[model samples]
Target: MISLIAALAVDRVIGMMPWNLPADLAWFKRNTLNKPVIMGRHTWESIGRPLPGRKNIILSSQPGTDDRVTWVKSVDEAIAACGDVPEIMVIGGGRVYEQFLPKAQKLYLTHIDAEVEGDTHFPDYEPDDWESVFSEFHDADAQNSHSYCFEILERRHHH
Candidate 1:
C-alpha cells in the first residue's frame, strides 16, 4: 500500500507560494524517518538533494543511476522497488500526487485555511471514496500565519 503526504491551501493550491507551516513540515519529517519516499523529478530538484534518514525514490524517465538515490521510471516501479515495506509516502509538487492519488490507500494532508495564487494545484478526488480517520487543528501564530488542520484520510473499501 502507498500513502500521499501534502499540504494544500483551501483552494487546493499546492505551490508557488512562500508559505511553510512548521507543524505540517514536522509531521512529514517525523513520519518519513527511515521510510521510502517517492517523488517526481521536479519535487526532487526543489529539495536539491536526497532527504536524510530515508530512501529517496525519484520517478523520472531519465532516472539516472545515482548510487545515492533509487530512481524508478514509473509509480508502479517505485512501489515494486520497495520490496515488502508496509507503505511508501508520495511527496509531490502536484502532478505526482495526481498520478498516485487513485492508488493510495491513505492521505496525510495539511489543509491550510488560506487561499493564495499558485500555478500548481492538488487534483480533485471523490469525497465519497475517502473517510477522515483523524484530524488536529492548529491556530495561527508568529511562525505560521494561517490556521490549518492536519487530516488523515483513508480510502474506503470498495464493494
Candidate 2:
C-alpha cells in the first residue's frame, strides 16, 4: 500500500507551524525505515538532506543536483522506480500531498493539540470516509510544547 506520513496542527497547518514533536518524528522514522520515501522538491529542500536508511525520491521537473536523491517528474514515476516495494511513503509539502492523497490507502498523521499560522497545509479529507485503525497520545514535553497524538487512518470501503 502507498502510505503518507505528516504532522499537522489544528487548521491543517504544516509549514510555519512552530512544533515538531519527537513522537511525530519517531513515528515517521519508524514507519519509513528501509522503505522508499517520495516527496516533492520543496519537501526535500525543506529537509535539506536525504533521510538516512531509505531511498529518497524527489518529485521535480527540474534536474536534481543531489546524488543522494533520485528525481522523478511525477508520482507514478517515483513508484515505478521503487520496484515492487511493499509500501512507499509520501512525505510532503502541500502540493505533493494533494496530488498523492487520492492514491494513498493509509495515512499516518500526527495531530497537534494547538492551532498555528502556516502558509502551507495538509490537504482536506472526509472524516467519514476513513477509519482510525490506531492511535497513541503523548503529553507535552520540554522539547515539544504541545501535546499530540499519532493516528493511523485507513480508507474505508463504501457500502
Best candidate per lDDT, number?
A: 2
Superposed by TM-score, candidate 2 places the C-alpha of residue 88 at a distance from the truth, in angstroms, of: 0.5
Candidate 1 lDDT for residue 63: 76
- Clash count list over all predictions: 0, 0
Q: What is the lDDT of residue 123 in candidate 1?
A: 77
Task: Give the total clashing residue pairs for model 1.
Answer: 0
- Candidate 2 at residue 98, lDDT? 88
Give the C-alpha miss distance for residue 74 in model 2, angstroms: 1.0
Clashes of 2: 0
* Pairs clashing within candidate 2: none
Q: Model 2, 23-108: lDDT tens per residue?
A: 67778899999999988888888888889999999998885788888999988898898888899999998998988888888999
